[PDB]
Amino acid sequence: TMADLEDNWETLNDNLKVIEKADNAAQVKDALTKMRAAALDAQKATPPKLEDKSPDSPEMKDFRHGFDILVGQIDDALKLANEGKVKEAQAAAEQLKTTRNAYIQKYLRSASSLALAIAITALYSAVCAVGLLGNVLVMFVIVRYTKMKTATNIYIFSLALAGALATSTLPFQSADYLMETWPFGELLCKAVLSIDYYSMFTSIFTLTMMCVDRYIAVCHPVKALDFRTPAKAKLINICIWVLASGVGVPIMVMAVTRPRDGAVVCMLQFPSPSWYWDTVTKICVFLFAFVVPILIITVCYGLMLLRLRSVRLLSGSKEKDRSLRRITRMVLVVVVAFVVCWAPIHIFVIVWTLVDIDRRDPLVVAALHLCIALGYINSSLNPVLYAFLDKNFKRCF
């Protein structure tokens, strides 16, 4: 793979400065031995530049020739380290730094992915500050000003609570992207992994229920006068936050910090066979937190347009039918926004599971982190936008 070639090319150049940092033959011999093996494995590989040229093409033959010169010089540098002379062995490494440039550098050029790390940090920070602060502000004015006397004010509070918890994880996973390791420990690993998943389910299901509530509001207004009670709305939202703890507790149970290649990882320890229960969870979060919520909201929309076509067919009120047609166009906004924000990451987790895509590629990292953010955007912007566009809410500002 390209990964192996990338890793070997790194060890070679890493063990090249270890010779400078070496003070005794013990360190000098160790670096040259690692460099030798790494060069021999790198000549077996294919450069990105020549990923289209014959294994017996002239460009391919020169690539491998450079490593033959390199190994040759390593062998000469090793004999001086074996003799116990660190002056000549350290000086032979100068001839090695020139050889990698003069023959192999032509085929193995690298670019600094600092520009991308900034763009990602920028996306996640803007999504965090807009989300987290926006939702806290929504929650505050639903408490201090427009006290939750209406059913909608309770659904928006629930949505904004779920949205604020969702974005409160971003600083930690934004840190993990930058340092590649999890420094916060198992207690904060269990706290972050659980809140992420739990706030995903509570945010989607109150959003879905909020669409059901507007369906009852539009289609059954005479019956809605009894269902859309703030006491009834409180029950539904409590059940949503109670129910989703069937995702919260299990994730919090298996969230663990484990060491991988010297670094620390915050992952999910699925029971044996992990790869099966991983797949189960994946097939479940796709059906429950995507497929089912879309069908419910789509059905609400379909019935809302159908039972507004019935009011239209009667040809009664021109003003009342147009007012309710606005609410039916916003449930379409909600479902199109939901799909455009959630399908990317749901597709990603499917293709990641099956297809082996190089997790290190800059285009793959830009696409993945843009998909992760899109999901955060849908749950942190849905309560903020509904609120600041709600007439009664706009007033208490």
Question: Where on the chain is the footprint of ligand OWY (CB under 6 A)?
Answer: 166, 196-197, 199-200, 203, 282, 285, 345-346, 348-349, 352, 368, 372, 375-376, 379
Task: Give the one residue of 282, 307, 361, 374 binding its own copies; rule: CB under 8 A.
Answer: 361
Residue 29, token pair as written in the block? 């011999």
Q: Rounded to the nearest whole angstrom, what is the least distance from the CB of residue 6 to its own copies in the complex?
A: 5
Q: Within positions 26 to 85, which residues make up the interface with its own copies, using CB under 8 A?
A: 48-49
* 2 lines the binding site for its own copies (CB under 8 A): yes
Q: For its own copies, give the closer residue by CB, 172 or 198.
A: 172
By CB under 8 A, is residue 392 in contact with its own copies? no
CB of 364 to its own copies, least distance (A): 9
Task: Count Cβ atoms within 10 A of the Cβ of residue 230 and give its class: 0-12 exposed, 13-18 middle, 19 or more buried.
Answer: middle
Give Cα separations from 99 to 17, 39, 49, 231 (angstroms). 15, 12, 19, 78
Judged by CB under 8 A, the stretch of 138-146, 266-274, 308-316, 355-363 that binds its own copies is 355-363
The correct pick among 308, 381, 382, 383 for binding its own copies (CB under 8 A) is 381
Measured CA to CA, the distance from residue 28 to residue 77 in angstroms comes to 9
Q: Kind and range of the H or E element at 280?
A: helix 274-286
Structure tokens of 44?
């077996």
Stretch that binds its own copies, among 7-15, 85-93, 211-219, 271-279 (CB under 8 A): 7-15
Does residue 246 touch its own copies according to CB under 8 A?
no
How near is the Cβ of 120 to ligand OWY at its closest, in Å? Answer: 13
CB 145 within 8 A of CB 396: yes
Say if CB 17 and CB 59 are below 8 A apart: no
Binding window for its own copies (CB under 8 A); candidates: 54-62, 128-136, 225-233, 262-270: 128-136
360 binds, among ligand OWY, its own copies, none (CB under 5 to 8 A by kind): its own copies
The tokens of 212 are what? 């059901």
Contact by Cβ (8 Å): 13, 19: no
The size of the interface with its own copies (CB under 8 A), counted in residues, is 50
Would you give the distance in Å from CA 255 to the centre of its chain? 17
Residue 346: name its binding partner from ligand OWY, its own copies, none (Cβ under 5 to 8 Å by kind).
ligand OWY
Longest dimension (CA), the chain: 103
Nearest approach, Cβ of 138 to its own copies (angstroms)?
13
273: number of Cβ within 10 Å:
9
Residue owning tokens 């999901």: 375
Record the tokens describing residue 28, joined without a space. 């000098």
- For its own copies, give the closer residue by CB, 76 or 361: 361
The DSSP line for 26-89 is HHHHHHHHHHHHHHHHHTTS--STTTTS-TTSHHHHHHHHHHHHHHHHHHHHHHHHHHT-HHHH
**What is the SS3 assignment for 1?**
coil
**Least distance CB 193 / ligand OWY (angstroms):** 8
Beta carbon of residue 361, minimum distance to its own copies (angstroms, whole number): 6
Nearer to ligand OWY, 216 or 256 (CB): 256
Residue ranges in contact with its own copies by CB under 8 A: 2, 5-7, 9-11, 14, 48-49, 108-114, 117-118, 121-123, 125-130, 133-134, 319, 322-323, 326, 358, 360-362, 381, 384-386, 388-391, 393-395, 397
